[PDB]
């Protein structure tokens, strides 16, 4: 999990949309100016909550390091979600939205592991939270995250 210089530069441009005066910090007033400029109207309490979620040192404003930490963490989340979606679609060989036992057995072989049907069936049972005998996308997400 890491960012390139170019990605950091883009996040600095995003930061500058919020840091209205260019001092290097985002205040609740600056975040509220942005939101109002988009037709929103959050309360002061809501704005402070949003600052606090990113404000790691508790000083009441968001600096670029704090902003970057947050954008990096969210980027890591988005990238993980895409990797899991791609892996799901590879397993769902016919594209019908469900991994069958035969698809699981064939795709694991293709990915480098030889399973018996005994093993395959056990894996389907482990994943199957809706009792339909197949692994759907949500079930696959739950296995890949726990």
């Amino acid at each position: 999990d890491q960012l390139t210089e170019e990605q950091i530069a883009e996040f600095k441009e995003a930061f500058s949309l919020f840091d209205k005066d260019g001092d290097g910090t985002i205040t609740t007033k600056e975040l509220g100016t942005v939101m109002r400029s988009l037709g929103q109207n959050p309360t002061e309490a809501e704005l402070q909550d949003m600052i606090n979620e990113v404000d790691a040192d508790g000083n009441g404003t968001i600096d670029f390091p704090e902003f970057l930490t947050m954008m990096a963490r969210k980027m890591k989340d988005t990238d993980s979600e895409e990797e899991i979606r791609e892996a799901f679609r590879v397993f769902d060989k016919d594209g019908n939205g469900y991994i069958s036992a035969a698809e699981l057995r064939h795709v694991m072989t293709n990915l480098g592991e030889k399973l018996t049907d005994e093993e395959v069936d056990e894996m389907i049972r482990e994943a199957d939270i809706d009792g339909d005998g197949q692994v759907n996308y949500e079930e696959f997400v739950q296995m890949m995250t726990a």
């Binding site: 995003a14 975040l31 942005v34 988009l38 809501e46 949003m50």
Partner: peptide, 11 residues
């Protein structure tokens, strides 16, 4: 870009 960042700031 504004919308993108706000999604991440939303509670």
């Amino acid at each position: 870009k504004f919308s993108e960042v706000l999604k991440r700031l939303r509670l």
